[model samples]
Target: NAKRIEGLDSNVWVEFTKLAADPSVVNLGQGFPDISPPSYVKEELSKAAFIDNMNQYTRGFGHPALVKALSCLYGKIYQRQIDPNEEILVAVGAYGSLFNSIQGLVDPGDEVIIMVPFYDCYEPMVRMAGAVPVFIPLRSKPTDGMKWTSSDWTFDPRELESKFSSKTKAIILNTPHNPLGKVYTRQELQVIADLCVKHDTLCISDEVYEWLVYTGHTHVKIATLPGMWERTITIGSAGKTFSVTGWKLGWSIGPAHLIKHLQTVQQNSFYTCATPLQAALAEAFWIDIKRMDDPECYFNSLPKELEVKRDRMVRLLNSVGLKPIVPDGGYFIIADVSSLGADLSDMNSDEPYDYKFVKWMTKHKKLTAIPVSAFCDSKSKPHFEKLVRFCFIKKDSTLDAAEEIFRAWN
Candidate 1:
């Protein structure tokens, strides 16, 4: 591998996913739903297969129908007319969109501000683009003996503003944030937006979990803020949206000029996404747009359903003596396992506590989860060593099996 790829060989997923593959393990280490997407979505794909020219490549930037659908859907959400042809670029997945954004816009030595305990890929992608990643962890405020919620996880405004400098080219913001499941409030977003505007830094807003917010919370798009539209590249995932991770489809929405750069990266690399999948997703979006306000719409219904599961997982973890940081959004939950009192000194001393603990649980208890430290930069890993992330978008049986494991251990 070239220098750009050096030191990137180690991946938490590569190791943990292998451990999670055991048939006996009730796996919740990764973030994907075991359930199928809406019936209409799969039906549309089947219908698209027979449609003319659906199998071949369509537009390089995006399939025409899909881009138009995206424009209409987001235009309503953002309350602005989006240019279908100029502002949208569909890619293999949100991962592809992130790669394109970094490779296209960022230059060598440009510093990209990334919140610590990020998606893990953000740091590697920045490094691969020959850019520097500046880390700022979201610190947990003291709860005064109360149970902590994800909203309690916050960044100091002064610390955040200090990270911005002349070399700062972009800031990656994830809400309905992964692992932590913290949904950025409108006020919190405004603070970041103000700094981005002042510093003239681009915002790569990863709103993949946009529609997964729970009760009493809303997903705010940072791009919709004043002075942000031109400088922000918002990314969304169909996999995350429709619960179809196997489809591997995603898109980027931004200003024409910024989108053109991402389009260039796509045109040179993947060139285009699968046409039939795009068409089906377009059809799905059209259906969603028509029923946008209806409570039964998948967008509205999924979170409603997942919110129940979230509460169940929280109760289950609590019963098992693990303290959970109740999420206001997203499917994953990170729990404080420090109180579990499991003696893991037998494991490798160099490994983070959560890492060793999760490994032990997977092999001995047949229950798997991701270590929170895996998402942090090395300097911040110690702070998160007592937490582990569990995916709650699983089936009832999976959750029940995990509960049984907890009971057996007790």
Candidate 2:
């Protein structure tokens, strides 16, 4: 057993998802959508699967058609032409892209800065690369009774700048951040961008939820900030983009100098992504690009649909006395369950309050959500111990079932 793999054996998804596996439980634990992807996505996969060459490997770095589609789409978004051949590297998932970025760029003993309550994978991945993960949490600003949105969660500027030093290699930025669902504002991003420029730190920008922002919020790519493009590796996911998580395809876009290192990681590991899947995604992107301006396009429409679901989820949690922090983007909602004050003294005292509460809720209430503490480091865990994350990308029927469970409990 390698030292890198030690203490990484247990995972929140494995444990909580097993609890959610009981047929009676109304599961809102994992982040995958319960809704089907756009019809064109499925249709393209069927079309590609029957093509003889689509079954065989295409390109090592990325399938040509797919990278071309990516470059076209992101070029418009980033307002600059992207070199498909030199800039993009497709991997297994955003997870794979993250792995390659860290393993390829971060040296052992280098320090990586991570925001707390982040996607859980970031910490372990940095550790596995033999790098140290420095933690800074998004602290809640007192709203003075104003309505709370994910925007209320923010990082202190001086505190953040203090974390940077000579050994700091990179900072992992997840906009429309997981668990907290806090979409980074342009001003907020500029603060971090300035620090990165001052410290000469690389940025691993995980913009997987770029398309999921609500009406009032905008998803700004940090790469678009001046001095950022040259130092940032931007990661995007087909799974998140098209609601086909099972497809497991993702890509990284950066300068040729940086992307070449990621290509090295890809070639030695999972050599190439699934050819059929890449072709299907390429076809889907072509369709979207044609209708990019249309309101009905999945890219433009998904966030609109999800916003309603997010509102409904807020209502559902509020009805049960669980206060939810309305999200500006992303598939999840984290609610304060402290008001419920459910007794959990019987559960192991060493476990965080959220862990015990979630387990108890799953067993007794027949509803499941992930503990927020599971997404934090030890120092930040206590702050999030009263919170739990629920996926809002589920079907209306699924949300209705969750509502029914809450009603029954009340």
Candidate 3:
């Protein structure tokens, strides 16, 4: 019926966002922030908007200023020299970069291994690119764990090693991962890096939550591991980095050989990112570097505020008998709703338990969240039943509203 859209199912966020749009629902469903970045971000955007000729395209591959700033900032962070001209390709967003990577690198019949409970877009992207998506679930501790922290999610060495083969084209690695918020330690990353090297597999490393890490945990780039620089493509988003989801700016960094394909894909697809936004992002990057030591800077400061929100949200959820998987990074929290014993037998739907629970939460309870089941495949859902994700990158008042929901619920 539609042109080439078969494999692409409607996203879970769409339905949840619609459910969230009701004035009464306290939306914590989608991962987007309800608040804007600091005033400096808006100032930069306005400054770029006012510059003569900046509204037009600067470069098809990337805006010169933004790419240079990205190169400078990442080179320091990644511990390698990055050629801004050839090694960086700006896309519509991190989503675009991920699409480009799959389309360019994956051939028909090629197998792309995806870690389960992944970002929902990954499976469809691999399928759309004519590739097979091989899913391997991240094993959880305590077997039936819910009160466990995100770090309790682990992968077995033999299980992971068995997934790689001659047909394995690439592995999608999301660190400071989505939903789970499992920031891969240096040890954990080396395990995967070694397998990639052995299997000659390419890594599409998604490190968009690079800076959202907590105090004890760290975001280790798989690309920084031994022999990984040659085949790894690291993707980051300006929206995530600056707390401005509307900016729609993201870039891929890798060796020129690997990056050129993404550049070709960019030219063929969106052609170029927005010029003014790119300019503003360039300025934002410089600001971050300049104030690297300043705790008040948005980069350093945003996480502190988020950390407080995370702790408070977790505390509130736990007090109400919901068991939360405390995350080490990012603004999302996943909690176990099984203990609540919500009666869903009347719903008369085929959805997972968490899905039913979240729908009930939104419509009746007036609080919205996403089912962790949406992030899992059929086989993995049973293992993660009753887990729901909430985005806490919101104002204190918003958190108070959620806290109020908890207070009123029981």
Candidate 4:
């Protein structure tokens, strides 16, 4: 998992997974579902793989039908006319799309501002693209201790404003963010949009979990913000949307002029996603394949089910004295493991303390979690170390099995 950047080989999820695979280990690390995509979508694939011309390589940009369907689906939802021929480029996955975008646009030493407690990808992407990954940790507000608010992870617009310079190339924005599960409010994004407009910054909006939000929060697309439609490079994922991470179908939606540059890089690397999958995806859109919606659909059922599992995990952690941060959306939640006090990484260690703890837990307790500090660079520190991220979007039986492991732990 070496990155194009020098120092970013520190993903907590990847580092922990080595131990997470143990038959004894209860995996709370990675977020991909143990479940499959919805029945309708799955069945679509079964037919596509056997049916006619869908078997061949798709057109470089996309299968014609897939492109047509995507344009309509996102256009109606995002309120932007995405040109099937130009505005979208479906990559192997969202991760590959992000890689191509950065490598395509950013020059060496260019600056890209990223929020703190971020998913582990953005920093390395910027670095690999030869851009400086500017840090602005979402400062946690002091809590009264009884009622914990996710809003505690708010940014100071003034401080954020100061970070944008002439060299600032873009900002990678994730909503219903990973790890912390902080959904950026409209008020929050407006401030960010003002900065991007003021400084000519491109907004690389990653909204893969756009439909996964809950707990009374709404997911706002930054491109939908006033004056931002032209400046934002919006990305979406079918894997997260359908609970089929194996599909790896992700697309970048933006103005044609901008995506053309991304297309250059994408063309150079990988030309197209799988053909059969594209055809099946096209079929899914024709039927309005929104994430688990029907009583029969997993999109609606999955979240409702995951919420119960999330609460169960939270209760288990709380009982063990780990402070679990409630997630508003997505498959992940972070819990503070500082109360354990067994190990703490100091300045000298190559990896943070939680790295070792996660490794230990995977071996001894047969539990796996990502070290929170792995998301930060040299500039950020052990501040993120007190916590560890756990993924809750597992099968009911798996969650129950993890629950048993937790009970056996403390």
Model 1 lDDT tens row, 221-254 = 9999999999999999999999999898888999
Question: Which pairs clash (backbone N, Cα, C closer than 3 Å) in model 2?
Answer: none
Off by over 4 Å in 2: none
Rank ordering of all candidates by TM-score, starting from the highest: 2, 1, 3, 4
RMSD each, Å: 1.1, 1.0, 1.8, 2.8
Error of 2 at 181 (Å): 0.9
lDDT of 2: 0.92
Sort by lDDT, best first: what order?
Answer: 2, 1, 3, 4
In candidate 3, which residue ranges exceed 4 Å CA deviation?
1-4, 143-147
lDDT tens digits, residue span 84-171, model 2 = 9899999999999999999899998999999998898999999999999999999998874866789989999999999999999999
TM-score of each: 0.98, 0.98, 0.97, 0.92
Query: Which RMSD does model 1 reach against the true structure?
Result: 1.1
Worst 10 residues of 4 by lDDT: 341-350
Summing lDDT over every window of 10 consecutive residues in candidate 2, give the lowest-scoring window.
Answer: 8-17
Steric collisions counted per model: 0, 0, 0, 4
**Residue 205, model 2, lDDT:** 97
> What TM-score does candidate 3 reach?
0.97
Off by over 4 Å in 4: 1-15, 289-299, 341-350
